[PDB]
Design a protein around this ligand. Structure first.
Ligand SMILES: Nc1ncnc2c1ncn2[C@@H]1O[C@H](COP(=O)(O)OP(=O)(O)O)[C@@H](O)[C@H]1O
Ligand SMILES: Nc1ncnc2c1ncn2[C@@H]1O[C@H](COP(=O)(O)OP(=O)(O)O)[C@@H](O)[C@H]1O
Ligand SMILES: [Mg+2]
Lengths: 197, 198
């Protein structure tokens, strides 16, 4: 099939407004856009949670078939989870001029004590584009999982790939970045082990 | 050093306050809380801004006879700044109101967003979209559909092969969390799913 029909030049962002500015922002976009029927929308407003964008690293040890996870509290999980302490990927915000790879390698070293060898891109995704602009770009990084060490009150975990994926299936890992990375690993680990040996 | 799998509760968190920062269509709250530390003791009072927009039900519409998936296309303006286009190919989805089940919402949105009656369902998974800054949880089901009944009922409905939809995930043409998660799951499970549903 065709895939999507329209691009940026088919929408006019009339103006934006910051409704709240603190650590993060809440912005109001005012815009018009082309309709699938040909016409041009009326003026539309949407509230958009703006918090910058992130780099994510899945630390994979291809020799051991293990991943490294980081555990820490995410208070926003409280209301819909049995515990707000989550098992997650290495991640960090991307500041201006930084690259995904730079941030990913830096965070693996200081959150988990991991020197990263080769990296490969996994996927870059929008976390929830109806309400937030946030994009997260995921890499897989080559590590020796036996060297993992924890140093922002964080506990470092080493688990087999198979157990980490079973925990996705069971709901014990249930944050988007980790689910997406570990599903991708379940689809690609044979090729990745072949490539990284 | 690290905790190897082969070798805290909510009583360990004190939510002191939730302070309203913004109330409009969505909400922004300041959570003020304390929590137990891995090395013992409690943290001091910590504050976090949290985007509150409720929770959602997501349905991956899968025709197992035809090995096809139904996608819905619509503009998501928050995608603008980082995407080639703000029109996104997505799963059927809708907010869960109080007292509604994931299954009720998923089946309703499928019918109204895409004209699909849904047969059997299976859970895929339920995930937190971005738990450092938002409480939003999305619960995905796979739904059995007859893809030759999909019709747009501003939204455009696409019917594509599963292999095409998954190739679009690989290429980045589908890159929203819900659709990526659903379609990666389908790629891991379609062989057994198709057999169970035929
Ligand atoms: N980001 C937003 N800001 C303000 N209103 C919104 C926003 N997103 C959705 N809405 C409101 O909710 C309705 C449903 O929009 P849609 O995004 O298609 O559903 P959902 O948000 O449940 O996925 C719209 O008519 C709109 O008025
Ligand atoms: N939702 C938020 N509200 C307020 N501040 C935040 C939020 N998320 C991150 N920060 C700030 O960014 C810093 C690093 O964030 P991160 O490492 O992701 O979370 P934390 O270290 O608090 O578990 C924190 O010290 C905190 O001040
Ligand atoms: Mg970080």
């Amino acid at each position: 099939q065709q895939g999507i029909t329209f691009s940026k030049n088919d929408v006019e962002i009339i103006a934006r407004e910051t409704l709240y500015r603190g650590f993060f922002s809440l912005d109001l976009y005012r815009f018009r856009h082309r309709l699938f029927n040909g016409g041009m929308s009326g003026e539309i407003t949407r509230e958009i949670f703006e918090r910058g964008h992130a780099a994510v690293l899945l630390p994979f040890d291809p020799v051991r078939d293990e991943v490294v996870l980081v555990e820490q509290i995410r208070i926003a999980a409280y209301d819909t989870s049995e515990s707000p302490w989550l098992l997650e990927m290495v991640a960090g915000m991307i500041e201006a001029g930084e690259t995904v790879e730079d941030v990913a390698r830096r965070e693996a070293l200081e959150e988990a004590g991991l020197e990263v060898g080769r990296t490969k891109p996994i996927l870059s995704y929008l976390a929830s584009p109806g309400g937030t602009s946030e994009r997260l770009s995921i890499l897989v990084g080559e590590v020796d999982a036996s060297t993992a060490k924890g140093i922002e009150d964080i506990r470092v975990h080493v688990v087999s790939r198979e157990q980490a994926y079973q925990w996705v299936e069971e709901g014990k890992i249930d944050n988007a970045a980790s689910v997406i990375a570990l599903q991708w690993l379940q689809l690609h680990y044979h090729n990745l082990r072949n490539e990284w040996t």
